[PDB]
Structure 1
Amino acid sequence: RTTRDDLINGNSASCADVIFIYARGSTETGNLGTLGPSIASNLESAFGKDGVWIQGVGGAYRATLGDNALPRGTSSAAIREMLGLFQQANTKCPDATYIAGGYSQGAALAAASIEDLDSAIRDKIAGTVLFGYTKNLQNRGRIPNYPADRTKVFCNTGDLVCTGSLIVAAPHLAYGPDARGPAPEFLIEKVRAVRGS
């Protein structure tokens, strides 16, 4: 449901082929929040339960609303937590293909983490999806040091956070349809592009 720690719980002897690391939005529950579960279910349908590990960013990432105002759109502690998860993935399952995603503050967190990640690990992330990307205008719709072709941003018309503000309006809470269809569609496509099938 809202909490998945497949990577942390997973046995290195039987690594999944795909590992998905996702950061929730501000004030959301568990480590997956409102959008994570929908994406997870669809990934599982495509690769099978044993074929994909779903891992939300918990630990030090409290998803505190106020942290949206910090320089990188989230806290240093949160970035350290997500970086640690990518490092864990690389250590536990070096041959798996990684994919990532984030919503709202989680999107800024995903972007910041990926930007700071060691290139060798970053290059293993086949695709990343960002919903209500708080640094969309500032970063020109990109994740620093990460290819545009592997990035997909979902920014609704009227969602003020995509336009340089921190105001939360109704369109910011309307990403349900995207998480149910195009987002997992994109991730699946990007994984198959490099892994074949």
Structure 2
Amino acid sequence: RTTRDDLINGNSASCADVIFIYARGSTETGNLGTLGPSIASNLESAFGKDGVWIQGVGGAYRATLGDNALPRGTSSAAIREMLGLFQQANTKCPDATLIAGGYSQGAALAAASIEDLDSAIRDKIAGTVLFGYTKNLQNRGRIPNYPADRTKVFCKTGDLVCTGSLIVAAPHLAYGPDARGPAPEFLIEKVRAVRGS
């Protein structure tokens, strides 16, 4: 449900073909929050329970509201935690295709991590989805050092965080439908583009 640690718990001798690393929004529960489970269910339908590992970013990532105001839109501790998960994935399962996503503060965290990532690992992330991307304006809708074709940003009209602000308005909480359909659709398409099927 709201907590998934498939990568950490996963057996290296039986690596999934796809590994999804996801960062929740501020004040959300578990390590998946409100949107992660919906994405997870759909990925499982496409690749099978044994075909995909769902890993939320927990540990040092406390998803503290105040951290949105920090330089990168999240804490240094949180970036360290997500970088460590990508590193663990790369080590435990070198042939797995990676995919990532984040919501709100988690979207900033995802962008910051991917930006700092070793290029050899970053290049393994076939697609990334960002909802209510807090650095959308600042980054011009991109993730630094990461291709636009592998990025999909969901930013609703009226969601002030997508427009350079840190104010939380109603549209910021309306990504449910996106997480249930277009987000996983994008991720599945990007994985199949490289892995075939």
Structure 1 runs (4+) deviating above 2 angstroms are none
SS at match of 1:67: helix
Aligned residues with identical type, % of pairs: 99
Q: CA RMSD in A?
A: 0.1
Query: By how many angstroms is 1:3 displaced?
Result: 0.1
Shift of 1:196: 0.1
Task: Find the counterpart in structure 2 of residue 58 from structure 1.
Answer: 58
In the TM superposition, what is the alpha-carbon distance from 1:127 to its structure 2 partner? 0.1
- CA shift at 1:109, angstroms? 0.0
Q: CA deviation at 1:39?
A: 0.1
SS state at 1:49 partner = coil
1:156, distance to aligned residue in structure 2 (A): 0.2
How far residue 164 of structure 1 moved from its aligned partner, in angstroms, is 0.1
Structure 2 match to 1:48: 48
In 1, distance between residues paired with 2:34 and 2:28? 7
Equivalent-residue separation in structure 1 for 2:13 and 2:191 (angstroms): 22
TM-score (norm: length of structure 2): 1.00
CA drift of 1:140 comes to: 0.1
Deviation at 1:119, TM superposition (A): 0.1
Post-superposition Cα deviations, 1:82-124, rounded to whole Å, max 9, x if no partner, equal 0000000000000000000000000000000000000000000
3-state secondary structure, aligned to 1:161: helix
Structure 2 residue matching 1:50: 3-state secondary structure: coil
Q: State the TM-score, normalized to the length of structure 1.
A: 1.00
- Give the Å deviation of 1:152: 0.1
SS of equivalent to 1:158: coil
**TM-fit CA distance, 1:21:** 0.1
Task: State the secondary structure of the residue aligned to 1:38.
Answer: helix
Unaligned runs of 5+ in 2: none
Unpaired stretches in structure 1, ≥5 consecutive residues: none
* Structure 1 residue matching 2:4: 3-state secondary structure: coil
Residues 38-76 of structure 1, C-alpha deviations (whole Å, 9 max, x = no match) = 000000000000000000000000000000000000000
SS at match of 1:19: strand
In 2: Cα distance, 1:94 partner to 1:24 partner = 25
| CA deviations over 1:143-180 (Å, ceiling 9, x no partner) | 00000000000000000000000000000000000000
For 1:170 and 1:14, locate their aligned partners in 2 and report how far apart those are by CA, in whole Å: 43
Question: 1:8 — aligned with what?
Answer: 8
Quote the Cα distance in structure 1 between the aligned partners of 2:128 and 2:104. Answer: 14
